[PDB]
Amino acid sequence: VLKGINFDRSIVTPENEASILDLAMQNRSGVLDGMTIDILNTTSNQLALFHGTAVLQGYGIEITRAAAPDVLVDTTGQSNETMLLCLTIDLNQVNVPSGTVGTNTYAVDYKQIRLEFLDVPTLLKQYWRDHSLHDLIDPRRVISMPLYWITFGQTGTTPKYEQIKSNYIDGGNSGNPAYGIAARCENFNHFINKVAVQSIPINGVANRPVSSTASQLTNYKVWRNPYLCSQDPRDKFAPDNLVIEEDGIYRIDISGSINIANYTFPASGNSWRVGGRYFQIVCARNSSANNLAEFGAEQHLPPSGVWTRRVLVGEYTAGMTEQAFSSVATISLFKGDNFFLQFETGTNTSRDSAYNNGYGTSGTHLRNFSYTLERVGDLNGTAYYDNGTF
Amino acid sequence: VLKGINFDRSIVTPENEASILDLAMQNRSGVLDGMTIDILNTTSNQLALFHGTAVLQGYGIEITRAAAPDVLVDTTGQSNETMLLCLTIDLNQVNVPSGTVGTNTYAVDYKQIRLEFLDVPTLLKQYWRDHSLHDLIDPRRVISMPLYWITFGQTGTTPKYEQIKSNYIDGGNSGNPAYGIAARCENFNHFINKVAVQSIPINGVANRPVSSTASQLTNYKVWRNPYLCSQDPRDKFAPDNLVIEEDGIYRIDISGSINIANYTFPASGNSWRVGGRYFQIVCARNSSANNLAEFGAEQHLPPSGVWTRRVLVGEYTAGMTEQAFSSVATISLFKGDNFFLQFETGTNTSRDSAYNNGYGTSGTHLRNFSYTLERVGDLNGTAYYDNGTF
Amino acid sequence: VLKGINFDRSIVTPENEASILDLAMQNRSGVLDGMTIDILNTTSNQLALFHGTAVLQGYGIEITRAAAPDVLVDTTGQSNETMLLCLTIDLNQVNVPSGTVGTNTYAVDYKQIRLEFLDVPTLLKQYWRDHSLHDLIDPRRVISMPLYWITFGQTGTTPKYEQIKSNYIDGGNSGNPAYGIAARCENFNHFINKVAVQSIPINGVANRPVSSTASQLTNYKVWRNPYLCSQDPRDKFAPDNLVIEEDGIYRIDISGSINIANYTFPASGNSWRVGGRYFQIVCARNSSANNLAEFGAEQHLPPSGVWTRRVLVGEYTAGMTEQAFSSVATISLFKGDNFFLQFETGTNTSRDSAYNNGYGTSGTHLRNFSYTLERVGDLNGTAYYDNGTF
Ligand SMILES: CO[C@H]1O[C@H](CO[C@@H]2O[C@@H]([C@H](O)CO)[C@H](O)[C@H]2O[C@@H]2O[C@H](CO)[C@@H](O)[C@H](O)[C@H]2NC(C)=O)[C@@H](O)[C@H](O)[C@H]1O
Ligand SMILES: CO[C@H]1O[C@H](CO[C@@H]2O[C@@H]([C@H](O)CO)[C@H](O)[C@H]2O[C@@H]2O[C@H](CO)[C@@H](O)[C@H](O)[C@H]2NC(C)=O)[C@@H](O)[C@H](O)[C@H]1O
Numbered sequence A, B, C: 001v002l003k004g005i006n007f008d009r010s011i012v013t014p015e016n017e018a019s020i021l022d023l024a025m026q027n028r029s030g031v032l033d034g035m036t037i038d039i040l041n042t043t044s045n046q047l048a049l050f051h052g053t054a055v056l057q058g059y060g061i062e063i064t065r066a067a068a069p070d071v072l073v074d075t076t077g078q079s080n081e082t083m084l085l086c087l088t089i090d091l092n093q094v095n096v097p098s099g100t101v102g103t104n105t106y107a108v109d110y111k112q113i114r115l116e117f118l119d120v121p122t123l124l125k126q127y128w129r130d131h132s133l134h135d136l137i138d139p140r141r142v143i144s145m146p147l148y149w150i151t152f153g154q155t156g157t158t159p160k161y162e163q164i165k166s167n168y169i170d171g172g173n174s175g176n177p178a179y180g181i182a183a184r185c186e187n188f189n190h191f192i193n194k195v196a197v198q199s200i201p202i203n204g205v206a207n208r209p210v211s212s213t214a215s216q217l218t219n220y221k222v223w224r225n226p227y228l229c230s231q232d233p234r235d236k237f238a239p240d241n242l243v244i245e246e247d248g249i250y251r252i253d254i255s256g257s258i259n260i261a262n263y264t265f266p267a268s269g270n271s272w273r274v275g276g277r278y279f280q281i282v283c284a285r286n287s288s289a290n291n292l293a294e295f296g297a298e299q300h301l302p303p304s305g306v307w308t309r310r311v312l313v314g315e316y317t318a319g320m321t322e323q324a325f326s327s328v329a330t331i332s333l334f335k336g337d338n339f340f341l342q343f344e345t346g347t348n349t350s351r352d353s354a355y356n357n358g359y360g361t362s363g364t365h366l367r368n369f370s371y372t373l374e375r376v377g378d379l380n381g382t383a384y385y386d387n388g389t390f
């Protein structure tokens, strides 16, 4: 039959209001405030956490403040292991109320909520990002959110910790928690190596031209939303590649200029004409390596025929010392993919190369280069096949 | 007086929680999951639909699953007609509860909800996209959402169906259901016809240069959000024009290059200088034709003085084989408008044209062209006059 | 302990549903409909307001309609003063219910809600944009939203009014009330003054080239979201500067062309080659002047090392009559900042200037220039330091 959920004779249930809050959270779960580690109240037998609020698939969870320690987690038996401190909902448990409304003594022991230590494969099997209490095909009764990596030493020591920032709704994304900016940087300058194809380092270190003869590795301001992307965990790829943590349609914006651009000088032989040199800036995706996503999670397989390379800028050098460019594209990206930018040109500097024979500021380089990567759409349902291939 | 809705002594009503959910849905109504046609359980007297959830102006509607058929709709009397299968709320009806809380027998016969067949003019008069149960000036008591076009044959046959995808919140837009991408495509190449003004085909078929002498009509990947736009229903305009289904401020992004660009060769007569050729890429809107929107709905009239053409790129060819361009603009668009892109230049190839005398890859063409159209703002209230003219 | 808010044994309180609605409003408060001044029912002792709905930090407030006047505010004693008509929540007050559910006589006198006149410093101390009933560190019990500037004359006169549009959720932003477009304009043409550095007038008046000898100040279509930005209140800066009203990560899009661009003519002395002229378009922020934000509110101090200038386009003129450009960047902006765009070039027209010696249409000018400024992210929590410096 046709059932009303919100109608005059309907009864609004806990699962109902949780389904509503989850919708209002854009289906993202996470710590809204607090719930950070309290090292002052942390011993070799207990782990303390500060007061706070979290939402786990529409269910509101609170750690209350009193007198500190706001909450204590038992670490007895945990030793020489790296574990995940998790906030878990278990709907098989029974919440035990006591006292009464009428007296001011109503209280509930929420057995459906626990703070616990899980190993990575156990967390992954019940991770909110992959499984749901509200799921249509495989509904679950137990779901978890990892808060910290906890590394226990020898019996008698206090553990080392690392916050799982993807599960904290800190700042930057509050009104649009599942979307917004994935990555952005300030303008930077980067020397173009004398090769046909090279990646542009987008993760905060550029090879900056500093003199007429030299360039040097220099930091530039960069920011990443840990819920959406991360710097590649492999050192070979760490300067250049992002790992996508969330499927979606993303928008890539790039701008900058090619400085000391090469071209064939107008001479009597070529009828006093500039001989332009072709170059292209491409964005790229690659999913050959599995388990690059956070916790080594299984990558999300893309639809058959998915793009791998997309031309953002494709033209010739125009005979000027410096030539600006800009491009904006929407692209599909999947959890586990590598995403990167490449500069392409010919390798013969006297015929087809956009780069010259100089080094440092005398050599061809990218100047005032910057980008923004932003999540703008999801790939759920039919969009996976209709929108996911490009 | 000043009335609190959500305060300590307030009573939260069904209309209240529905007004809240509608706000959380960005005022969009639609099927959240399921509610697709079940052809196995569909006969010549009954039409079956699968279990699912929908939200209609903040009211949650559910089709429950048991044992299939999840729901049955009576088709007796319906013959040789094209009808709309609609999900309707009728607040003049009375929901009849039975049983009691205390026993586990409470149940409601939701007479305020029906699955019914309506003709197009009846649906349009009570369509959620134009009328509201919550409306300030003209509040309604009956509102509908069309799910399928149902074409009934002769008495004794099973009907033909077509899903109304604009009313299904499938994928791509989940956390931002009333906004997000309207249209996007992969990079494509398109031959420039030897004319002053031409539309750029944005609906998935381009005239691709394939040899030094020929171009051929070739499909490219394109995606449209049916809630926001559709391919023009008239075959004359179908390769080039979108029909806007929803008023708003939209963002248009374009990028690509002009390949084999024409220019006046540097000769002794012009003092060995490149003679550039002017061209422009414009976006355009046109509302002269009424009833282009879904169901032949009345177009939304724009404010007096509304724009019709906007220059996105305006410059000269620079004497290079290929020259890149990019542009981003925000524009107002109205339900029923045609939206399209045009390429403009002179027609004298020896004096003012950006195009040459070649064909296929030897002729001037757009290369690596792509666009994104996205809804970024609404045109309700004062924004209609202040923001709606440009 | 671990407390559930939305669980099976939980009791959902008024503060709970208000916290949920505030989340659904992206933490923005404001009038959703109506609540505009009713001058027909306004006298020298009373001020009338029309029926409407507002949300103040998740609490729903309603002015009910009956028979007009929908509500009356006492103005006795108010004279020769500029005051703020405010909608205030005071949780120290007690809402007084009367009658009963069972009879159809339940009614509440909402003493926790008032319409009142406050001076600017009192409003600022309890302004919802700076303080919260839900605040973690400094929770408040009294919070206000200003609706109108009310200027009272001599005893016996009806007052003058000015709507505070930043506190009315009118149109343009309904589904994304705290984000969306801040400012946008139609294409305009602007003469480039013969100077090294100049601001580009973004607030609706451009110096339009109209003849081969003259340019004239001409209006162009522009729109600003008053919640996000305003035209500079100082006449010296009013044509060029925006005042940012809300912290965040913003996206700036620019496009246009440089028409009648200057360059060194190819002559025998320079080996028949175009001598390009460097120019750059920069966006800029400046927070030296405090109290530029609405009501003269204290500016939000940026993190140490914050950017002030960012190159959007940096290149040489290419020897063409007209050269197009486009750029998209994300930038941090703070409440109280000035935001503006600048055009930069050399001042020697025979050696390094992108501008020539002409005036009007014969002189170098920006053609088809337009921009969009949009709020795309917040700067709360850790994002303030990690994302706020660029
Ligand atoms: C396991 O898959 C991984 O490898 C993908 C491909 O790597 C490129 O292939 C090699 C050689 O071409 C042949 O082995 C290069 O080392 C890789 O590309 C280079 O990466 C470095 C580091 O990021 C760049 O600085 C360099 O510019 C780039 N070289 C070229 C020629 O483009 C990789 O793309 C996958 O993402 C990854 O998982
Ligand atoms: C009923 O209004 C409809 O017509 C609008 C105008 O159509 C153009 O006008 C004619 C001729 O100029 C004179 O009759 C062209 O056929 C139409 O423009 C052309 O459309 C085709 C198909 O999309 C393009 O391939 C072609 O490039 C374009 N021609 C030119 C010169 O630009 C129409 O714009 C409204 O949208 C529509 O409702």
Ligand SMILES: CO[C@H]1O[C@H](CO[C@@H]2O[C@@H]([C@H](O)CO)[C@H](O)[C@H]2O[C@@H]2O[C@H](CO)[C@@H](O)[C@H](O)[C@H]2NC(C)=O)[C@@H](O)[C@H](O)[C@H]1O
Residues within 6 Å of the ligand: C197, C198, C199, C236, C237, C238, C240, C241, C286, C288, C289, C338
């Ligand atoms: C109180 O801080 C304010 O002033 C900031 C700087 O103003 C510029 O400085 C002077 C002179 O360079 C030296 O006093 C100029 O008058 C100001 O810049 C100019 O502003 C006008 C009006 O907007 C522009 O038309 C003009 O192009 C621009 N001049 C130059 C050379 O760029 C100001 O930036 C702060 O925002 C403001 O609060």
